Each structure stands twice: as structure tokens, then as C-alpha cells.
Design a protein around this motif. Structure first.
Motif, PDB file in Angstrom:
ATOM      1  N   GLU A   1     -25.593  29.899  43.559  1.00 58.34           N
ATOM      2  CA  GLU A   1     -26.850  30.428  43.054  1.00 58.34           C
ATOM      3  C   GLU A   1     -27.418  29.585  41.930  1.00 58.34           C
ATOM      4  O   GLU A   1     -26.692  28.887  41.236  1.00 58.34           O
ATOM      5  N   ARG A   2     -28.728  29.656  41.753  1.00 58.92           N
ATOM      6  CA  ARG A   2     -29.378  28.871  40.726  1.00 58.92           C
ATOM      7  C   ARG A   2     -29.072  29.485  39.378  1.00 58.92           C
ATOM      8  O   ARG A   2     -29.046  30.703  39.248  1.00 58.92           O
ATOM      9  N   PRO A   3     -28.815  28.637  38.375  1.00 61.00           N
ATOM     10  CA  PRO A   3     -28.409  29.074  37.040  1.00 61.00           C
ATOM     11  C   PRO A   3     -29.370  30.075  36.440  1.00 61.00           C
ATOM     12  O   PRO A   3     -30.546  30.044  36.758  1.00 61.00           O
TER      13      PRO A   3
ATOM     14  N   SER B   1     -29.873  33.564  22.811  1.00 61.05           N
ATOM     15  CA  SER B   1     -30.313  32.693  23.917  1.00 61.05           C
ATOM     16  C   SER B   1     -29.267  31.738  24.493  1.00 61.05           C
ATOM     17  O   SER B   1     -28.573  31.024  23.761  1.00 61.05           O
ATOM     18  N   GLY B   2     -29.214  31.678  25.822  1.00 60.37           N
ATOM     19  CA  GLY B   2     -28.266  30.800  26.489  1.00 60.37           C
ATOM     20  C   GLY B   2     -28.357  30.772  28.004  1.00 60.37           C
ATOM     21  O   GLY B   2     -29.418  31.028  28.576  1.00 60.37           O
ATOM     22  N   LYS B   3     -27.234  30.479  28.658  1.00 58.50           N
ATOM     23  CA  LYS B   3     -27.224  30.269  30.100  1.00 58.50           C
ATOM     24  C   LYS B   3     -25.887  30.613  30.762  1.00 58.50           C
ATOM     25  O   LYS B   3     -24.821  30.333  30.220  1.00 58.50           O
ATOM     26  N   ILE B   4     -25.961  31.236  31.938  1.00 56.07           N
ATOM     27  CA  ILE B   4     -24.777  31.548  32.734  1.00 56.07           C
ATOM     28  C   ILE B   4     -24.938  31.138  34.198  1.00 56.07           C
ATOM     29  O   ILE B   4     -26.020  31.249  34.789  1.00 56.07           O
ATOM     30  N   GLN B   5     -23.838  30.661  34.769  1.00 49.76           N
ATOM     31  CA  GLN B   5     -23.811  30.114  36.117  1.00 49.76           C
ATOM     32  C   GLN B   5     -23.051  31.023  37.052  1.00 49.76           C
ATOM     33  O   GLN B   5     -21.839  31.112  36.958  1.00 49.76           O
ATOM     34  N   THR B   6     -23.742  31.692  37.963  1.00 52.58           N
ATOM     35  CA  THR B   6     -23.062  32.653  38.812  1.00 52.58           C
ATOM     36  C   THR B   6     -22.786  32.124  40.208  1.00 52.58           C
ATOM     37  O   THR B   6     -23.386  31.148  40.653  1.00 52.58           O
ATOM     38  N   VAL B   7     -21.845  32.788  40.873  1.00 50.22           N
ATOM     39  CA  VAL B   7     -21.486  32.566  42.265  1.00 50.22           C
ATOM     40  C   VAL B   7     -21.433  33.928  42.933  1.00 50.22           C
ATOM     41  O   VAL B   7     -21.026  34.911  42.314  1.00 50.22           O
ATOM     42  N   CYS B   8     -21.862  33.995  44.185  1.00 44.41           N
ATOM     43  CA  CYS B   8     -21.865  35.257  44.903  1.00 44.41           C
ATOM     44  C   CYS B   8     -20.913  35.211  46.077  1.00 44.41           C
ATOM     45  O   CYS B   8     -21.216  34.610  47.098  1.00 44.41           O
ATOM     46  N   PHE B   9     -19.758  35.841  45.926  1.00 51.47           N
ATOM     47  CA  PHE B   9     -18.790  35.915  47.001  1.00 51.47           C
ATOM     48  C   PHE B   9     -19.160  37.014  47.972  1.00 51.47           C
ATOM     49  O   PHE B   9     -19.484  38.125  47.569  1.00 51.47           O
ATOM     50  N   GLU B  10     -19.123  36.702  49.258  1.00 51.42           N
ATOM     51  CA  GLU B  10     -19.185  37.754  50.251  1.00 51.42           C
ATOM     52  C   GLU B  10     -18.028  37.522  51.179  1.00 51.42           C
ATOM     53  O   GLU B  10     -17.603  36.382  51.339  1.00 51.42           O
ATOM     54  N   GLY B  11     -17.484  38.574  51.779  1.00 48.01           N
ATOM     55  CA  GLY B  11     -16.406  38.324  52.715  1.00 48.01           C
ATOM     56  C   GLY B  11     -15.555  39.494  53.123  1.00 48.01           C
ATOM     57  O   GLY B  11     -16.031  40.612  53.199  1.00 48.01           O
ATOM     58  N   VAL B  12     -14.287  39.212  53.398  1.00 51.19           N
ATOM     59  CA  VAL B  12     -13.334  40.203  53.873  1.00 51.19           C
ATOM     60  C   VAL B  12     -12.027  40.183  53.097  1.00 51.19           C
ATOM     61  O   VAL B  12     -11.349  39.151  53.023  1.00 51.19           O
ATOM     62  N   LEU B  13     -11.676  41.336  52.540  1.00 49.82           N
ATOM     63  CA  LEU B  13     -10.411  41.514  51.848  1.00 49.82           C
ATOM     64  C   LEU B  13      -9.546  42.544  52.555  1.00 49.82           C
ATOM     65  O   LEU B  13     -10.042  43.320  53.362  1.00 49.82           O
ATOM     66  N   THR B  14      -8.255  42.547  52.238  1.00 48.67           N
ATOM     67  CA  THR B  14      -7.339  43.584  52.700  1.00 48.67           C
ATOM     68  C   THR B  14      -6.738  44.274  51.490  1.00 48.67           C
ATOM     69  O   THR B  14      -6.241  43.609  50.592  1.00 48.67           O
ATOM     70  N   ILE B  15      -6.777  45.602  51.463  1.00 49.44           N
ATOM     71  CA  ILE B  15      -6.312  46.351  50.301  1.00 49.44           C
ATOM     72  C   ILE B  15      -4.785  46.401  50.221  1.00 49.44           C
ATOM     73  O   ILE B  15      -4.106  46.551  51.231  1.00 49.44           O
ATOM     74  N   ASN B  16      -4.249  46.275  49.013  1.00 50.11           N
ATOM     75  CA  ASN B  16      -2.811  46.349  48.816  1.00 50.11           C
ATOM     76  C   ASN B  16      -2.391  47.434  47.831  1.00 50.11           C
ATOM     77  O   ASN B  16      -1.234  47.838  47.810  1.00 50.11           O
ATOM     78  N   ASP B  17      -3.329  47.910  47.024  1.00 46.79           N
ATOM     79  CA  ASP B  17      -3.008  48.899  46.006  1.00 46.79           C
ATOM     80  C   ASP B  17      -4.246  49.671  45.588  1.00 46.79           C
ATOM     81  O   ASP B  17      -4.860  49.360  44.573  1.00 46.79           O
ATOM     82  N   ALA B  18      -4.579  50.696  46.366  1.00 45.97           N
ATOM     83  CA  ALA B  18      -5.834  51.434  46.224  1.00 45.97           C
ATOM     84  C   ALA B  18      -6.253  51.784  44.789  1.00 45.97           C
ATOM     85  O   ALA B  18      -7.387  51.522  44.416  1.00 45.97           O
TER      86      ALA B  18
END
Length: 191
Positions: A138-140, A147-164
RNA sequence: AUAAACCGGGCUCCCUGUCGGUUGUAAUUGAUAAUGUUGAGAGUUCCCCGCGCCAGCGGGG
């Protein structure tokens, strides 16, 4: 294990920058949110998990809202979405200086995909296992009385639960820095 | 302190009544916007606090 999930819009008036987005959100009621349409004519579409019920105001209109309890069966695979900013904290190479008097520390973003995925699997720990992930770049974002700046990433996908339970309060607490600027919120969905 | 001084040109008064600017009228025929081009690289991201084994990790803006 409870929460309030809402669809909220903020008039483009105030939504001009992050700070006022977070403000407009605060005035409705902590909480977490995901930006879904940043700049439309009507304003700004945002998904909102919270602890308190929101109430529509002049700046932030609540479209729809509902209250939710989490019941997750371990072993079940889920689709997920998470907007967050992977970082590494170091000591300034410009050797700038802190307020106390020694040199400053800086949060730099992780810019390699493998590192980002790694960061994900790391932060969610033994709650779930990521089985499939795509790290959307994603664009910064900048922000303006600080005042400042943050750099994000957007994960999408598939996980498997191990500990609800673990996973659940991960969802309710949020994952990663900059929670008040669009990040943190993890959304899950049935396969 | 001057052909000066002192020193009003001043009173009264509708411009009023009548009056379609109206009939008739294609802007019309012709017309590629076309050739050529990695977005690559790059962990700086500004403030407060906690923990640090000083590699960094985390909470809040």
C-alpha cells in the motif's frame, strides 16, 4: 469474548487526514478500525470493531451495527484480512538525539515480502497458522499537532486456528503498531 | 476694519386619461489522433512510555 461491529462513514469534511478520522471515530463512543473506501464524495467508509455501541453524529454516520460473540472451533481454517505495519526498531544512523540526551531510536518498515510474512506468523504466534498469504503493498500514509509517516501492508489469506481464546483476544486487542491510524483490526471469515 | 459695515428673494402648484408588434422559415453535406516506453530501487518513521540481554521487542499518539 464480546464486541460491537459497525459500518461507519465519516463525511469527507473531516476525513481529510488520519488524525481527524480517529477523532471522528472517538466522538462516537477503546476500539479498532479498517479503512475500506478512503475518499468518496460522501466521505470515508470504515469498518469498526469496538467495546461500546456507537451513536451517529454530524461527522460520522453509523450505517449499520450489530453486536457479536466469538465462538471459534480450533482446527477450522479461516479466511482473514489484516492491515498493519511491520517494523524494526533501531538506533538512528543519522545519530540524532533523544530528549533525555542519548541517540534516538527509529521505527523503520520491513520492505521484503518474506520479512513481512515472517512478521505476521510471528505476531500471531501459536494462536493460528498462516496457510496462505498475500501481502498487499500500500501507498505510504502521512499525518499532520504532531506529524509523521507510517508504511502499511495489507495481508489477506488463509489461516488455521490452533488456540481459540488466544486468537480471540488477539482479534480484540489488535496486531501491530499504529492501532489508532487504521491498523490492528483482524477480520475473519468462514471458508 | 476695504463703495466698507449691518444685510434671506421669499410664500402657493398631479402632467393627467386610451393602446397585441403581429403572420411565415433543416444549418446542411465530408473527416484514424496515430507510431514508441521496467517503476525500478530502497528497511528513516516524527513524538510519549514500559521492558531490554543494547540484537531489539511491545503499549499509546
Amino acid at each position: 469474548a464480546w464486541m460491537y461491529l459497525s459500518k461507519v462513514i465519516i463525511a469527507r469534511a473531516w476525513s481529510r487526514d488520519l488524525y481527524q478520522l480517529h477523532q471522528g471515530l472517538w466522538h462516537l463512543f477503546d476500539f479498532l478500525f479498517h479503512v475500506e473506501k478512503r475518499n468518496t464524495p460522501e466521505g470515508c467508509h470504515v469498518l469498526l470493531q469496538s467495546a461500546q455501541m456507537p451513536v451517529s453524529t454530524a461527522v460520522a454516520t453509523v450505517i449499520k451495527t450489530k453486536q457479536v460473540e466469538f465462538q471459534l472451533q480450533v482446527g477450522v481454517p479461516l479466511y482473514f484480512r489484516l492491515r498493519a505495519n511491520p517494523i524494526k526498531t533501531i538506533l538512528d544512523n543519522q545519530k540524532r538525539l533523544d530528549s533525555k540526551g542519548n541517540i534516538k531510536r527509529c521505527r523503520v518498515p520491513l520492505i521484503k515480502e518474506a520479512e513481512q510474512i515472517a512478521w505476521l506468523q510471528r505476531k500471531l504466534g501459536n494462536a493460528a497458522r498462516v496457510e496462505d498469504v498475500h501481502p498487499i503493498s500500500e501507498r505510504p500514509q502521512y499525518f499532520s499537532g504532531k506529524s509523521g509517516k507510517i508504511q502499511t501492508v495489507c495481508f489477506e489469506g488463509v489461516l488455521t486456528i490452533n488456540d481459540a481464546p488466544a486468537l480471540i483476544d488477539l482479534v480484540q486487542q489488535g496486531i501491530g503498531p499504529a492501532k489508532s491510524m487504521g491498523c490492528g483490526l483482524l477480520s475473519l471469515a468462514p471458508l
